[PDB]
Design a protein around this ligand. Structure first.
Ligand SMILES: Nc1ncnc2c1ncn2[C@@H]1O[C@H](COP(=O)(O)OP(=O)(O)OP(=O)(O)O)[C@@H](O)[C@H]1O
Ligand SMILES: [Mg+2]
Ligand SMILES: [Mg+2]
Length: 378
């Protein structure tokens, strides 16, 4: 049974092997498969070869589509999202979200179920190349805020592939189960349960849960979330900043050309990630940005944090929500464990730590924890 963490930006694959849980590496020997599909004239590509083409083939490269599951085109959520995409979003005949691209010489209209199914197919093939056997049974991750329609949409995708999804697993339940199996020296059943808070901020959302653990027993006490706050919001802030800085210094409007704006998003995200390990002034350099002009600017962590002041304030809100629901007090919590790509942002970690009055723990592998939990389920 393969565990599949299908993220809006990246995917991971895990499976129970002899002894424990292993992540499965792909044809680039990587655990991480970008959630990106590129449609060419002779074929299509999925993963990093698609992602590497995202500027060159921007109109026919599809990404960040996970949050379209179970959504109507007319939803203000989708109307907003639509504006930032390099590819065409149109309504399907049933009102759902349609993805229009040029493919095998012809115009194609895809549902999100169909797009996700193309991604699932690659992951399935990846697992089969490593295990040297057919893969059918799987567990697929879903955010803990996904509604029943959004979940059914993901199941519909898996059925298109011919996968037998035994279970859609809540990301935070994935993480909890992972912890519950791997954490050493949990309390005995005859001891006071250990209350752990899990925080997962990915590209598109912020999720938090509280769980009580004993050896062989897990109880989820509550979950909270901001489905509209993730790593990408921070990218957006940097992009808006440099877009204006470049209008001033170079009189170039990045917003006017989509492939320049995309490239600006790429650079700002790279910059964001680097500021997690480097606090000094860091270069942003984009060769031949537009009108053959090279552009340049700089940024450091402290300035990034000031720019993202309002976003960082939003971090404590789901934490407050969690306590409100569970009636837990921070002193009840033994540890705060982080997982996911964007929780690593030092200002985000700091806000969490200050809220619970505890240092942040990193017992689990932040990138792999969800897939590993999915692989544990069955
Ligand atoms: N070291 C780092 N510092 C800061 N941000 C990072 C770092 N590594 C990854 N990120 C950010 O984390 C996000 C990706 O997180 P993750 O892989 O958990 O998302 P996902 O699971 O694909 O998406 P979603 O949770 O929205 O489905 C991106 O915004 C990325 O820029
Ligand atoms: Mg995720
Ligand atoms: Mg792990």
């Amino acid at each position: 049974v393969v565990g599949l963490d299908v993220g809006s930006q990246s995917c991971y694959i895990a499976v129970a092997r002899a002894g424990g849980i292993e992540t499965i590496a792909n044809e680039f020997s990587d655990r991480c498969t970008p959630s990106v599909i590129s449609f060419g004239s002779k074929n299509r590509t999925i993963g990093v070869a698609a992602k590497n083409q995202q500027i060159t083939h921007a109109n026919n490269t599809v990404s960040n589509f996970k949050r379209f599951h179970g959504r109507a085109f007319n939803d203000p959520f989708i109307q907003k999202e639509k504006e930032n995409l390099s590819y065409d979003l149109v309504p399907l005949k049933n009102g759902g979200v349609g993805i229009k691209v040029m493919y095998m010489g012809e115009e194609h209209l895809f549902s999100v179920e169909q797009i996700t199914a193309m991604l699932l197919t690659k992951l399935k093939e990846t697992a089969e190349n490593s295990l040297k056997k057919p893969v059918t049974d799987c567990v697929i991750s879903v955010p803990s805020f996904f509604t029943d329609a959004e979940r059914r949409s993901v199941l519909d995708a898996a059925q298109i592939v011919g996968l037998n999804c035994l279970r859609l697993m809540n990301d935070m339940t994935a993480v909890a189960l992972n912890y519950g199996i791997y954490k050493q020296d949990l309390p005995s059943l005859d001891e006071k349960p250990r209350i752990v808070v899990f925080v997962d901020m990915g590209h598109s959302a912020f999720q938090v849960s509280a769980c009580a653990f004993n050896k062989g027993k897990l109880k989820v006490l509550g979950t909270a979330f901001d489905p509209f706050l993730g790593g990408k919001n921070f990218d957006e802030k940097l992009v808006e900043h440099f877009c204006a800085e470049f209008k001033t210094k170079y009189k170039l409007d990045a917003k006017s050309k989509i492939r320049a704006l995309l490239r600006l998003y790429q650079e700002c995200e790279k910059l964001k990630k680097l500021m997690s390990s480097n606090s000094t002034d860091l270069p942003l350099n984009i060769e031949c940005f537009m009108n053959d002009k090279d552009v340049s600017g700089k940024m450091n962590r402290s300035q990034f944090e000031e720019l993202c002041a309002e976003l960082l304030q939003k971090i404590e809100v789901p934490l407050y929500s969690l306590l409100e629901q569970t009636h837990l007090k921070v002193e009840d919590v033994s540890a705060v464990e982080i997982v996911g790509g964007a929780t690593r942002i030092p200002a985000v970690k700091e806000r969490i730590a200050k809220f619970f009055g505890k240092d942040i723990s990193t017992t689990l592998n932040a990138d792999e924890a969800v897939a590993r939990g999915c692989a544990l389920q069955c």
